[model samples]
Target: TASVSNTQNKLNELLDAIRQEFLQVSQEANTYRLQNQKDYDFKMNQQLAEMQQIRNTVYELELTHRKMKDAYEEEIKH
Candidate 1:
């Protein structure tokens, strides 16, 4: 009976140690996931802003082209 108790105590200690290690690892994983998510969001916003600027530039170019074409047409009429 004493031997059985001793074996059980050792098993319990090992299980408790494993549980503590698992909790620490789990917490670290969660922190890493959150950091990655934050970085991704920031990059996405930066990309969106860049794309918006490009779109605005393209729109301005189109407007300039139209104006130039109109001016050329009027000069030709003269």
Candidate 2:
């Protein structure tokens, strides 16, 4: 349980870092878009897609974290 707790804590830290990175990237991308909105649609769409992917990944991590927590409890109950 101690090991699991440590791992969960680390995962939480990683999730927090990823969330911060997403925020930074989104802010930077928005700033760039505001400055050069008429440059082309390709790069803008690509960045938007990447941001969406990151958003999906965040949810995936959240689901996995929930699963891990449930499994840990099941292990103890067994």
Candidate 3:
């Protein structure tokens, strides 16, 4: 009975240690996942802003071209 009790105690201690180690690793994994998600979101936002700027510049160029074309047509008619 004494030997069996000792063995059970050792087994319980090992199980507790294993549980703690697994929880620690799980928490670390979640932390890394969240950090990466934030990084990805930030990069996406930056790219979106850059694309919007490009779109605005292109629109301005189109307007300028249209106005120039109208002026050229008027000058040719005169």
| lDDT assessment of candidate 3 | 0.99
Give every collision pair in model 1. none
- Candidate 3, 10: how far from true, in Å? 11
lDDT of 2 by residue, 1-78 (tens): 699999999999999999999999999999998668666676889899999999999999999999999999999998
RMSD of each: 3.2, 32.3, 3.3
Off-target runs (Cα >4 Å) in candidate 2 are: 1-39
lDDT of 3 at 50: 100
For candidate 3, which ten residues in a row score worst on lDDT? 1-10
Instruction: Report clash pairs, candidate 3.
Output: none
* lDDT by candidate, in order shown: 0.99, 0.93, 0.99
What order do you get sorting by TM-score, best first?
3, 1, 2
Q: Which regions of candidate 1 are displaced past 4 Å?
A: 1-19
Best of the two (1, 2) by TM-score: 1
1 versus 2: better lDDT goes to? 1
- For residues 1-78, could you state the per-residue lDDT of candidate 3 as single tens digits? 799999999999999999999999999999999999999999999999999999999999999999999999999998
> How big is the positional error of residue 44 in model 3, measured in Å on the Cα after superposition?
0.3
Which portions of model 3 show Cα errors greater than 4 Å? 1-20
